[PDB]
Protein: Lysine-specific demethylase 4D
Organism: Homo sapiens
Amino acid sequence: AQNPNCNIMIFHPTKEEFNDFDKYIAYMESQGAHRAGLAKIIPPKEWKARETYDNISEILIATPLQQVASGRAGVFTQYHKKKKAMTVGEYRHLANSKKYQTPPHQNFEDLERKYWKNRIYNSPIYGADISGSLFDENTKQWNLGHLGTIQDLLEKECGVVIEGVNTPYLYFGMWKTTFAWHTEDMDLYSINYLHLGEPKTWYVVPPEHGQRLERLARELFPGSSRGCGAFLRHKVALISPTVLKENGIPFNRITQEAGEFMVTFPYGYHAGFNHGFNCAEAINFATPRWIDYGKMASQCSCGEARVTFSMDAFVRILQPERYDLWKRGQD
Ligand SMILES: O=C(O)CNC(=O)C(=O)O
Ligand SMILES: [Mg+2]
Ligand code: NI
Ligand SMILES: [Zn+2]
């Protein structure tokens, strides 16, 4: 068995190996990358996502989200308070202001300490889930707006044609902006490209140990757990590395820098935070190995998790027994 300790693996594909996305995902898994739940891919030195980022300030963040925390430093929830629209130019200015800017620090480790110590006492503003792409249309390799669709993968594997589309999303972040512990919708893969700015730190639980994380979460968030059998689908719960270690939960951590891809694998729980002003782009995707995870994915039916149009068909074809109840939650 490749990568038995489930370490996060880092790949350095050549420009030749960067041509065929599917084949490279398959190669990574042949080396055991999926066991970690997360991998880093450093693109070849010849490659670029686009020529410059000099002209992005007029993108609109229609609904910036203020992330308000409750709980204790290592075990908290966050809710998202809607703010008035602002442009990326205005957001970058806000990120850099004295109130919101990254504090002086020695290194990534010092900054990680300061994040877990102090995150709960601030409410950073996140420009999340903005439909769109920053990849130049002429970028042919690993262009997140030109991947094969999850609807075509399901059709190719299973023979059934379904409605739905699959497009990327942009994330504008600042210091302390936070992504809660989650897996992807329908336990899909994700890919995330850090286009510009300051780093993003990630934590991940191996897919084979996901249920250990869920069991801890039910103990740490007991009211949430009673309210819904899959409350991590709400994307609001945070548990620190210190707390995970104290409870024997297997995990790994890695920091992503501008110009690097991350891939999360089916049923790999992940969480993390931004170091300062940045811009990431991400999309879900599927492979043949995903299908079995799709069929077994938990679902939120309490009504909070409210998800895309395109998830309907996945639940309808892969989870016909669940479909009724899950759709009652959606409607
Ligand atoms: O970048 C973020 O805020 C969150 N991203 C992810 O959870 C992902 O790419 O799967
Ligand atoms: Mg612009
Ligand atoms: Ni994710
Ligand atoms: Zn729920």
